C-alpha cells in the first residue's frame, strides 16, 4: 500500500539526514535529538495529501507503462522521496506563518514555537532547516536522476510563488496606496480591495502552488511523464481547485467549532480578505456595509459575534453552493480536456478533486 | 574598477527580480516599491566584502587565461551576479537573526523588523524571500552555465551548514544534556561547555561557510577554475580565516563603543560562547570563575560591568596577540601550499588574509 510505503520513507530520509547531522556537520546526540522532535511534531499528523499526490499520480503512471520491477521501486521511492520534499516545504511555511501570525494551535496541538525549550528564537531557525532538509534530499536521493534540474527549477519557483502569496495575505487588509516600511500601517475603511479578483491573486499565490501544482507536477517529472500532459491546462485545474481548497478553509475558520478544526479560528479579528468578507460585501446593502465596517477586523468579542451573524443572515449558503456548481463545471471541463493527451493523468486528477469537494 | 561593476550589477539584478514580479506574479505598483525598498535596506549599507571576494577571485583568473573580451565581460558578469547571491544570502540570515535574537541595531540603522510599517509579521516573510531572490538569480543569469549544477549544490550545502551553526549559536548557553522542546531552557550553571572545541565548531559553521567558502569557491566555479586548487587546502584556509573574523567580532561586541560598533554589543547579557568568555574561563582563578557565574547573561548593567572588568583584567590582549600570531603563521603556511596547484588563487587568498587582519 501507498501509505505504508510512503511513511516507511519518512523514516529512512529522517534517519539519512540524522546520520548526516552527526557524520558531515559534527552534530550532537542532544542536538540531533532536539532536531529529530522538530521534524516529526512539524512534519507529521496531517493527511498527508501533498506527499500522496505525488504517489498516486506516479501509481496511475506505473500502472499502463512497460517497467523491471526494480524501475517501479525505484519510481515509486522517488514519488515518496518528493512527496516529502513537499510536506517538509508545508512544514517550513506552517512554522513560520504561525510565528508571524501569533497563531495558538495547529492540530489540536500548540504551534512550534510555543513549546516550552522551543521560543520563537529556535523556531524561526527550525523553519529554516525544515526548508533546507528538502534540498538536502533532492541532491541526495535524485543525484543521477534525468528529472533532477527540472524539479528543482519547479520547486524553486512554486517556494518563491509562495512566499509572494503570504506577502499578498499578511498586507491584505491594508489600503495598497498606504503601503510604506516607514509608517504604521493602518487598516483600510473602504474594504475597497475586497474584490473576488484581489481574492484570487491572494489565493492562487499563497496556498495553490505548492499544494495542487507541485504535487501534481513533481508526479510527472518522477515518472518521466510531462510529455503526456499540456502543462497549461494542469496549471489552470491545479489553481481552480486550489481555489475552491482555500474558500472551503475560510469558512471553516469562522463556522467550524474549535475542537473540530483544531484551533480558535481568527480570520475576522485579523481582518483577513476571506472568501466570507468578500461575498459578503458583494451582496450587503448601505446599511450592512457601514455594520460591517464598525466591527471588522477587532479583537472585542461582541464585535465578532456581529460579523459572524451578519454573514449568516446575510446568506452566504446560496453563494457558495452557486460558486461551488461552478466550480464542478469548470473542474470536470479541465479533467475532459486532460483525456486528450492522458487518460491516466485526467484519472488522478479526478481523485484530486473527489478528495478536495468531500 | 570592480566595485562599480559589482554596484552596477545590483541596479540591473534589482531591476530583473522587481521586473519579473510585475509580468509574472501579478504583482501591484506598491508592493513592488515595498519590495524594493527592503532590498535596499537590508542588502546594502555593508563593505560587500563577501561578493566582491568572488569578484576578485575571477578577476586574479582573468589575468592569467586566454579569452575573448566578451567572454572577459561575461565572467565578471556571472562573478557579480554571484557575490550579490552571496549578499542576498548575508541579508537572509542578518534579517531573520536579527528578529530571533530581538536586536535593536544593524550598522547604525534600526533592524528591519523594527521599521513602523514592517513588523515581524512582514520581516520574517522578507526574510524568506531574500533567500528566494539568490535562488532566482541564479536560474536565470547561470540558465546555460556548465557550473550550474555545480554553484546550487554549493550553496544549498553553505546554507545549511550556516542554518547549522545559528543553532549551535544559539543554544550555546544551555547544557547539551537539557536540549529539551518540552521544557523551558536554562542557562548553564557549570560552563562546561564554554570550550574552545566547541566555540571552534558554532564559529565554523555559523559564519565561515557562508563568509570566507563560499565567495572563494564561487569565485572558482565562475572562472571554471576548480582543478587550479586543492579543495581541501581551500575548505581549512576558509575556516581559519573565518574564525579569526568571528574572533574579532567577539572582541569589539564587548569593548568597541557603540557609535563606532553601529549598535549597542549584548553579547554578555545574552550569555554567548564569545570567544572572550571562553578563553577567560581557560585562565581564570576558583574566585575569578565563582564571579563570572555570578554576574554572566543577565541584562542588570553592574552585572555586566564586573563581567567586563574580569574581561580586562585577565589581560585577554596577550590571548589574543598569541592566538593572533598562531594564525598569522597558519595562515601563511595554507597560502604557501596553494601556491603549489595556482599562484592566482594563493594571491587572492593572500588579499582576502589582509583585509581581515587589518
Ligand atoms: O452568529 C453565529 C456565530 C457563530 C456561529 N457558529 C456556528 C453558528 C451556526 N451557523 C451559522 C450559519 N452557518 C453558516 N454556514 C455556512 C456555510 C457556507 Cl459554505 C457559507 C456560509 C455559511 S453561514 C453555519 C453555522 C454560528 C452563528
Ligand atoms: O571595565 C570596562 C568596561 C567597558 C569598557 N569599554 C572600554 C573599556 C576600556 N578597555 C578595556 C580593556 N580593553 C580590552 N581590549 C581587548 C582587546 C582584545 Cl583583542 C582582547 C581583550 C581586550 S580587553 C580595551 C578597552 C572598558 C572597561
Ligand atoms: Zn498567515
Ligand atoms: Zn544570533
Not at 539526514?17 to 499528523?45: F, V, W
Not at 495558538?104 to 525549550?117: A, D, E, I, L, T
Not at 486532460?338 to 484530486?352: H, I, N, R
Request: with cysteine.
Amino acid at each position: 500500500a501507498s501509505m505504508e510505503r510512503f511513511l516507511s520513507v519518512y523514516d529512512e530520509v529522517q534517519a539519512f539526514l540524522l546520520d548526516q547531522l552527526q557524520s558531515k556537520y559534527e552534530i550532537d546526540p542532544n542536538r540531533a535529538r532536539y532536531l529529530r522532535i522538530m521534524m516529526d511534531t512539524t512534519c507529521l499528523g496531517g493527511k498527508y495529501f501533498r506527499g500522496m499526490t505525488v504517489v498516486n499520480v506516479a501509481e496511475g503512471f506505473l500502472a499502463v507503462t512497460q517497467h523491471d520491477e526494480a524501475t517501479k521501486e525505484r519510481i515509486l521511492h522517488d514519488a515518496c522521496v518528493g512527496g516529502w520534499m513537499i510536506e517538509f516545504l508545508q512544514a517550513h511555511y506552517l512554522v513560520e506563518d504561525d510565528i508571524m501570525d501569533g497563531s495558538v494551535m495547529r492540530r489540536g496541538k500548540p504551534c512550534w514555537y510555543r513549546f516550552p525549550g522551543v521560543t520563537t528564537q529556535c523556531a524561526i531557525n527550525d523553519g529554516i532547516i525544515l526548508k533546507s532538509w528538502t534540498q538536502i534530499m533532492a541532491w541526495h536521493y535524485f543525484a543521477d536522476r534525468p528529472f533532477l534540474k527540472d524539479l528543482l527549477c519547479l520547486f524553486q519557483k512554486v517556494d518563491y510563488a509562495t512566499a509572494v502569496g503570504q506577502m499578498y495575505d499578511v498586507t491584505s487588509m491594508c489600503d495598497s496606496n498606504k503601503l510604506d516600511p516607514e509608517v504604521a500601517q493602518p487598516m483600510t475603511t473602504d474594504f475597497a480591495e475586497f474584490t473576488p479578483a484581489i481574492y484570487k491573486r491572494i489565493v492562487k499565490y499563497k496556498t495553490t502552488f505548492y499544494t495542487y501544482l507541485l504535487p501534481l507536477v513533481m508526479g510527472l517529472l518522477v515518472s518521466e511523464a510531462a510529455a503526456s500532459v499540456e502543462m497549461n491546462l494542469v496549471e489552470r485545474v491545479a489553481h481552480l481547485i486550489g481555489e475552491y481548497f482555500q474558500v472551503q478553509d475560510d469558512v471553516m475558520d469562522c463556522f467550524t467549532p474549535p475542537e473540530q478544526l483544531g484551533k480558535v479560528g481568527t480570520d475576522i479579528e485579523d481582518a483577513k480578505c476571506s472568501w466570507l468578507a468578500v461575498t459578503f460585501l458583494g451582496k450587503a446593502n448601505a446599511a450592512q456595509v457601514a455594520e460591517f465596517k464598525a466591527n471588522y477586523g477587532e479583537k472585542d468579542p461582541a464585535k465578532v459575534a456581529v460579523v459572524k451573524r451578519l454573514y449568516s443572515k446575510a446568506n452566504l449558503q446560496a453563494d457558495f453552493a452557486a460558486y461551488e456548481a461552478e466550480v464542478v463545471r469548470e473542474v470536470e471541463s479541465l479533467i475532459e480536456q486532460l483525456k486528450v493527451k492522458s487518460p491516466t493523468f485526467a484519472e488522478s486528477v479526478a481523485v484530486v478533486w473527489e478528495k478536495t469537494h468531500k
